[PDB]
Design a protein around this nucleic acid. Structure first.
Lengths: 109, 95, 83, 121, 98, 95, 109, 85, 98
DNA sequence: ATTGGCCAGCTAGGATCACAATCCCGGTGCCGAGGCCGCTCAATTGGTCGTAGACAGCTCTAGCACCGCTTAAACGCACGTACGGATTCCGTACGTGCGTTTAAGCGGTGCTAGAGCTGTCTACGACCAATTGAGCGGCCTCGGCACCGGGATTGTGATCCTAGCTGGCCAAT
DNA sequence: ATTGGCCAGCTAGGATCACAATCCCGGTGCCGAGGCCGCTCAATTGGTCGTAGACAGCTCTAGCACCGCTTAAACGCACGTACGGAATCCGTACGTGCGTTTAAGCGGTGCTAGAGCTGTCTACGACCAATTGAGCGGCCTCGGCACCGGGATTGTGATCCTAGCTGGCCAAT
């Protein structure tokens, strides 16, 4: 009489938990009522962004011949990508250091 | 048994396996991603909340998230994110 | 006890190292007093906000979460401490 | 499809028709006898700008006259410097060039310049 | 006999401290500084280590960015030595102020 | 009879009379003050909201407003505002 | 049987409407529940700030020998006061213009 | 009904920029700066209008109401007082 | 015969346009500009006048502040003429970017 | 043959003159600010319910304090190059002021899309209980990698060799 | 008989060498990343019920379009002078390196405040219904203020006057 419980996530084809998002939205009193598709869409968005970051960072890792992502590879990924750097420009990433930038003038001739 | 603190780590891990099967991730990185995800989520949700009060409207539906996204993410992010979200919610409603 | 005059603990070479990370090649000896004063200001603000959250919670340990939230108020969000 | 990986953009900040003054042996003798600091006013006239006091002895000694002709706009530009000089320094410029030390200001201008158009022994 | 021309080792140092991430300020002095500051707002405070660590990451980041901007200014004046007038300028433009 | 839009004008005008009996105020100025008041109010209330979720706490009481104030207003404003608010809420509870 | 209705405002000794504040707080979904003293305190704060602004502006008006506050006066009041300028530093006041500031160097001698 | 208003940015005329600069306290202005500052401006307005029209599209209105513009600026971190914000 | 030494009338002009508040850009050209911009995001939009007016107040304020900062830079280079390198600098430091 | 003074001429600074800009004083009218009125909706008042949160008590994590040893970093000094900054000069690119062109501003009319409100209704979400499997913590382990050491490469500064000019001696002059 | 070619000495550019900073490669041993398991509770599922928001229909405010005078502003160009910026040369302050001093870091131990949890209970706020008067919009009216004409004052630019210096000839040496 009871259909096999499958998480809304599965219904959506996402890795991020939709139900968790939903719960947070209602626990955040963002509005008295939260539509059903809102947590789905939101989860999808977050998932996408995460995917993007992790892709770039891992790329940068293969460039350091490093198999495992550490905070520097995130800093590199982000700052080297203009779109994210705009998104995360006010953000300081602990243990991230800086993007190597020696101003042209400073180099001797 | 004591109060357990929710994070997103395992999901980030799954995503990462989809993107770079050979690659792992340090705990510190995971703390970064946790914070990051939370921050993005907060920005979007808060935007949605305000954009819903703005219209004397009570309910955050796909439309509000979509709008909020377009506002926050600049350009190509906005486009791809919107498209993906639409895809996902479509697939959800279909089943 | 009254800790006093600890700002000199931000020693000259440490300022020099931070500058190098900035890409600064040459530093006038006057920078040090300026950058200490700047830094003291910064801390004052951050710590005032953090302490204020602490006070409100009635905790007495300023907690990493409080610092992150303070920064978040300043528009200086910090990732990597449980934000 | 996938995004394109848009990279960030960052904000990053004279030997004309004469003999050389070193080949004109009397002028070379004067240029060797005077201190190098006397030559500045001559090199200012020769190039429309004096160079380093280190090179200044070379800069005057290697000069072989103007490529120009008298009455031309470059000759008028030499008259500007010579008219903005004063009779004592003009007579010193005459002396080191082996020119005779008499003349009213406008004669000093034209006589120095007629020589530096075609400096010869 | 060997002596680097002034500004060489400096450039090597830059390449090093940018390739690196480790904390540029000694931890214990910074800690005692933080406590000195807190002493004005509340007496006998206790700081989780993590909190101090966070403050340090923040303060370092802030100063680093400050020097980046300052350097920009200094170069823009055709100078190379950054001077307090360049920091004050940087702050004034950021909207930080004296 | 049509939908009527709330503003704060009349209150601002009362305040002003208490401060400068001889002085009036232009409509444009009033629009500025309206916007300003709304903005301050929004900042404080939003701060309170977040500072209450931060504590896993559900209710904004005088303590949250007070804290929020201290955070937002710099120095002498913080002091005097806090003092005044305390005074007012005291007087309220007394009657 | 019914006590004479007197606005909470009166009970508080404020010019700003406390009840209006209350209503907004609950209509803003800041939290599921809003304590009683919160709108009082908030109203008081807003009232204070308003008072401060108007005071300074009106002062500046008597310095322009102008009896009636116009946006320029607000701009003057705010920017000349440090504490507010810090509060309202990201704010652009329509019809406010600028605080007269000719950099020393620019003046001839 | 529908007319393209192309190449209208030159309507931010040289003297207008000169007046704005004077308000800034700028005493002397290069003649080349004007095309730069037009480009700057265009960028700014692009962002603002983007956000405004976004809000409007959400509200399903077809007219960007002042309330939209102010709210857009507010997100740009550049709050504007005096329009009902 | 009367001719102000260059930079005098300029200083008079500054004192004037700071004492004043009125809109420094002609309204109708700015309006047509705004519509030109909108034309890329949505076809046949309609703007309340008030909206345009708001946009103008914002735009003007932004540029004014930009020139203030720019001037600061320019003086800091011991120059007086502000140039594009000074604006680009100002923006780069504010965190606005090309 | 040289040195000092005289007449004429020139240039700099302090002052004088003229004019425009700024300001100030007072009269004018006009329109937006400010007051009054009736209505209505939002604020207020009273009684009820429960549940959020204050408070107290317990556990034990983790923050504090302190010590000693090692050692890298900090400090102080000597030294010298490169740099900042002052100076000068030059070209021209700005600024300023004419006359001219032009399109901004204003007011008016005409048109109507579309803002805004209201009523219907029902698709959607809140709430509840019952279900359960996804997610958390603990633990175990095992590969990634930071470190070390040898070898290789590169980069930097130090050095030598040669080409050129200048000075002295012997031979030529 | 004296000094210009010959050789010797000095200097600058190219080539060369030393050597030490960086890189590359293997090996190694560490411990944090990652998997597994069992338990828990938040996610799921179905049903019910109110309810707010999509939708059509409406009225009309407000945006858009077009027109024609009236200026004010934008424009283009001439003229010139203050500026930017290339050159230059000084002092020196900031770097670099060395040797000595300091205390950061580790790690290890001991102590205890107070974080975090749970349980109690209770004041406080949500809620509802009834009440009502504060606040709104519409009308009106009238004083502040923009303006403008005439003076008065100041700031600017152009000009004159007083002063010191320079050149050729005459007088004295």
């Amino acid at each position: 009489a009871r259909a096999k419980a499958k998480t809304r996530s599965s219904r959506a084809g996402l890795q991020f938990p939709v139900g968790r998002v939903h719960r947070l939205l209602r626990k955040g009193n963002y509005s008295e009522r939260v539509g059903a598709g809102a947590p789905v869409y939101l989860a999808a968005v977050l998932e996408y962004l995460t995917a993007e970051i992790l892709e770039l960072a891992g790329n940068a890792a293969r460039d350091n011949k490093k198999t495992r992502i550490i905070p520097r590879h995130l800093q590199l990924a982000i700052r080297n990508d203009e779109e994210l750097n705009k998104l995360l420009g006010r953000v300081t990433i602990a243990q991230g250091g800086v993007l190597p930038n020696i101003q042209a003038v400073l180099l001797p001739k | 048994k004591r109060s357990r603190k929710e994070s997103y780590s395992i999901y980030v891990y799954k995503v990462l396996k989809q993107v770079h099967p050979d690659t792992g991730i340090s705990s510190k990185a995971m703390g970064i991603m946790n914070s990051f995800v939370n921050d993005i989520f907060e920005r979007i949700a808060g935007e949605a909340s305000r954009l819903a009060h703005y219209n004397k409207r009570s309910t955050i539906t796909s439309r509000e998230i979509q709008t909020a996204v377009r506002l926050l993410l600049p350009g190509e992010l906005a486009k791809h994110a919107v498209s993906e979200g639409t895809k996902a919610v479509t697939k959800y409603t279909s089943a | 006890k009254v800790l006093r005059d600890n700002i000199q603990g931000i020693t000259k070479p440490a300022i020099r190292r931070l500058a190098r990370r900035g890409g600064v090649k040459r530093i006038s000896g006057l920078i040090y007093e300026e950058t200490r004063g700047v830094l003291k200001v910064f801390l004052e603000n951050v710590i005032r906000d953090a302490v204020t959250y602490t006070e409100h919670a009635k905790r007495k340990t300023v907690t990493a979460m409080d610092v992150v939230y303070a920064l978040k108020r300043q528009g200086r969000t910090l990732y990597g401490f449980g934000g | 499809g996938k995004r394109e990986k848009k990279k960030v953009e960052r904000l990053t900040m004279a030997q004309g028709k004469g003999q050389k003054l070193c080949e004109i042996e009397r002028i070379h003798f004067f240029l060797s006898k005077k201190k190098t600091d006397e030559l500045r006013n001559l090199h200012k006239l020769l190039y429309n700008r004096p160079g380093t006091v280190s090179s200044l002895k070379k800069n005057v000694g290697q000069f072989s006259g103007f490529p120009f002709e008298k009455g031309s706009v470059q000759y008028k530009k030499k008259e500007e410097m010579l008219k903005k000089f004063r009779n004592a320094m003009l007579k010193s410029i005459c002396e080191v060039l082996d020119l005779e030390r008499s003349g009213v200001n406008s004669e000093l201008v034209k006589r120095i310049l007629n020589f530096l158009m075609h400096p010869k022994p | 006999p060997h002596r680097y021309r002034p500004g060489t080792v400096a450039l090597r140092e830059i390449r090093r401290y940018q390739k690196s991430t480790e904390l540029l300020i000694r931890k214990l002095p910074f800690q005692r500084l933080v406590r000195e500051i807190a002493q004005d707002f509340k007496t006998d405070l206790r700081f989780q280590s993590s909190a101090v660590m966070a403050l340090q990451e923040a303060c370092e980041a802030y100063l680093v960015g400050l020097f980046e901007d300052t350097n920009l200014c200094a170069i823009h004046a055709k100078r190379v030595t950054i001077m307090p007038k360049d920091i004050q300028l940087a702050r004034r433009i950021r909207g930080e102020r004296a």
